[PDB]
Amino acid sequence: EPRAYPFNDVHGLTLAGRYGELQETEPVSRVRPPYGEEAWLVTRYEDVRAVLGDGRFVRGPSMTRDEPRTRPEMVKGGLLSMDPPEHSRLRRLVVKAFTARRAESLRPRAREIAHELVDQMAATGQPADLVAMFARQLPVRVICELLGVPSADHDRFTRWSGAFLSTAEVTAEEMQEAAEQAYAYMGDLIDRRRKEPTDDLVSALVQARDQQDSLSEQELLDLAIGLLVAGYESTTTQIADFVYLLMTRPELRRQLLDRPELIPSAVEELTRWVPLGVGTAFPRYAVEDVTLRGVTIRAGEPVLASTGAANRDQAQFPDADRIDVDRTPNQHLGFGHGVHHCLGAPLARVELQVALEVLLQRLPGIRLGIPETQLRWSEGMLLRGPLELPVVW
Ligand SMILES: CC[C@H]1OC(=O)/C=C/[C@H](C)[C@@H](O[C@@H]2O[C@H](C)C[C@H](N(C)C)[C@H]2O)[C@@H](C)C[C@@H](C)C(=O)/C=C/C=C/[C@@H]1CO[C@@H]1O[C@H](C)[C@@H](O)[C@@H](OC)[C@H]1OC
Numbered sequence: 370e371p372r373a374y375p376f377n378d379v380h381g382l383t384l385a386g387r388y389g390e391l392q393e394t395e396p397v398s399r400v401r402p403p404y405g406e407e408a409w410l411v412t413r414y415e416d417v418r419a420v421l422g423d424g425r426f427v428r429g430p431s432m433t434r435d436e437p438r439t440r441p442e443m444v445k446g447g448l449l450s451m452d453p454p455e456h457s458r459l460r461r462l463v464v465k466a467f468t469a470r471r472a473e474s475l476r477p478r479a480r481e482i483a484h485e486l487v488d489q490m491a492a493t494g495q496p497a498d499l500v501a502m503f504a505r506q507l508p509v510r511v512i513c514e515l516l517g518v519p520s521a522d523h524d525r526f527t528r529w530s531g532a533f534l535s536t537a538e539v540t541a542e543e544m545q546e547a548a549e550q551a552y553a554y555m556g557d558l559i560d561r562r563r564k565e566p567t568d569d570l571v572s573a574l575v576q577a578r579d580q581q582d583s584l585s586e587q588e589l590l591d592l593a594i595g596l597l598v599a600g601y602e603s604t605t606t607q608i609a610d611f612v613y614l615l616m617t618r619p620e621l622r623r624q625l626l627d628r629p630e631l632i633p634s635a636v637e638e639l640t641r642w643v644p645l646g647v648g649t650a651f652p653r654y655a656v657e658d659v660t661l662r663g664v665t666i667r668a669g670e671p672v673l674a675s676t677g678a679a680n681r682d683q684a685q686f687p688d689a690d691r692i693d694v695d696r697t698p699n700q701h702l703g704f705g706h707g708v709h710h711c712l713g714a715p716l717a718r719v720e721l722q723v724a725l726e727v728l729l730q731r732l733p734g735i736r737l738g739i740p741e742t743q744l745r746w747s748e749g750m751l752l753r754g755p756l757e758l759p760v761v762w
C-alpha cells in the first residue's frame with residue numbers, strides 16, 4: 370500500500386516529474402521514506418498552509434518515535450529538535466538578534482568578500498571551480514563576519530565546517546581537529562561576549578531575552594555550530610544550484626547583466642521555484658484525528674509537507690514548474706509556513722543577492738567550462754547541487 374519516498378533524488382535538479390504528476394493524480398499519498406515510520410504526504414498549496422497551520426499538528430512526538438526522514442540519524446540538534454512552548458521560547462529569542470537589519474549591515478563586507486573572491490579567481494587563471502573558489506567561500510567568511518570572528522581563524526572554520534559538509538571535501542583528521550578545538554573556540558568567544566558586549570551576533574544573543582529568559586552558553590554554542598555548519602551547508606548548496614543556473618542560462622545571464630535592478634525579482638522567482646532538494650518539510654504529527662481530502666488522519670499519525678513542490682503547484686502558479694523572472698510582486702512556500710519555517714532567509718537574501726551581483730559586476734565574461742551536463746554532484750540526502758563547477762571567461 371505505501372509509496373517509496375523520496376520522489377526527488379540526489380542525482381537531479383528540478384522537481385521530479387512523477388512528483389509533480391502525483392501532486393495532480395494522487396494529491397495526498399501514504400509514503401515510506403528510507404528511515405522512520407509510515408506517513409501521509411501532502412502536496413497542494415492550501416493543504417500545506419492547512420497542515421502546517423493548525424495547532425493540533427506539531428513536531429513534539431518526533432522526540433519518542435523514529436521519525437519519517439531521508440537520512441539514517443535522528444533530528445537531535447538545533448531548533449527542529451524542539452517543540453512549543455519550548456521551541457517558541459527559543460524562536461522568540463533568535464528572531465530579536467538574527468535580524469534583517471544586521472543582514473543589511475553585512476552586504477558591504479559580503480560584497481568586499483565577493484569582489485576579492487573574483488580578484489583571486491582572476492589572479493588564479495582559467496578554468497576555475499566556482500563552488501570551491503566562490504559558492505563554498507562566500508558564506509563561511511560573511512557568516513564569520515556576522516559573529517565578529519577574527520579573519521585569521523576564518524581559514525580554520527572553512528576547513529572545519531568543510532570536514533562536516535557534504536558540499537566540501539576535507540578529511541576526518543580535520544573533524545578530529547574541529548571536535549577538539551572549534552566548540553572550544555566559540556566558547557572562548559561566547560565567554561568574550563559575556564565579559565564585554567559588542568556589535569556582533571553572539572553579543573546580541575547574550576543580551577537579548579525572550580521576556581526575561583536567557584539563551585545559555587550551550588544554547589548559543591548549539592545555534593552557532595548549526596549556523597556555521599548547517600546554515601553553511603544550506604547556502605553553499607543553494608548558491609551552487611543558483612550559480613550553476615546563471616552558468617547554464619545565457620538569456621538570463623545577459624538579462625541581469627543588462628538590468629541589475631531585476632536581480633531581487635529573479636532571486637524571489639528562483640525562491641518561488643526552489644523544489645527544496647528532496648521536496649518536503651520534516652514530519653509533523655496530528656495529535657488527535659482530522660479528515661483531509663476524504664481520508665482520515667489519526668491521533669498520533671505523521672504528515673510530511675511537500676513544501677518545495679507546493680512552491681510549484683500549477684493550481685497556485687502559472688507554468689509553476691518553470692521560472693518566469695518577469696513576475697513581481699512575488700510570494701512563495703519552499704521554506705515552510707506559519708510556525709513551521711526555516712530561520713535563515715534574512716541572511717540568505719543577502720548571499721543570493723550579492724552572489725549574482727558582484728560576479729556580473731566583476732567578471733561577467735564568465736561561463737561553464739564543459740559540456741553542460743558533465744559535472745560532479747552533491748549527494749548528502751537533504752539538499753541538491755554541484756560539487757564542482759568549472760568556468761572559463
Ligand atoms: C544532509 C544535510 C545535513 O547534513 C547532516 O545532517 C549531517 C549530520 C552529521 C552526520 C552530524 O551528525 C549528527 O547529525 C544529527 C542531525 C545531529 C547530531 N548532533 C548535533 C545532535 C550530529 O552529531 C555531524 C557529524 C556534524 C554536526 C556538526 C551536525 O550536527 C551537522 C548538521 C548538518 C546538517 C545538514 C543540513 O541539514 C539540516 O539537517 C537537520 C537534521 C535539520 O533539522 C535541519 O537543520 C537546520 C536541516 O537544514 C537544512
Ligand code: HEM
Pocket residue numbers: 447448449460595596599600601603604605607645649650651652704705709710711712713714716717
Ligand atoms: C540557504 C537556504 C536554506 C535552505 C535551503 C534551508 C533548508 C532547511 C530545511 C529543509 C529546514 C527544515 C524545514 C522544516 O521541516 O521545518 C530548515 C530549517 C531550519 N534552518 Fe534553514 N535553510 C536555509 C538557510 C538557513 C540559514 C542560513 C540558517 C542559519 C541561521 C538556517 C537555520 C535553520 C533552522 C534553525 C531551522 C529550524 C527552524 C525552526 O524550526 O525554528 N537555515 N532549513
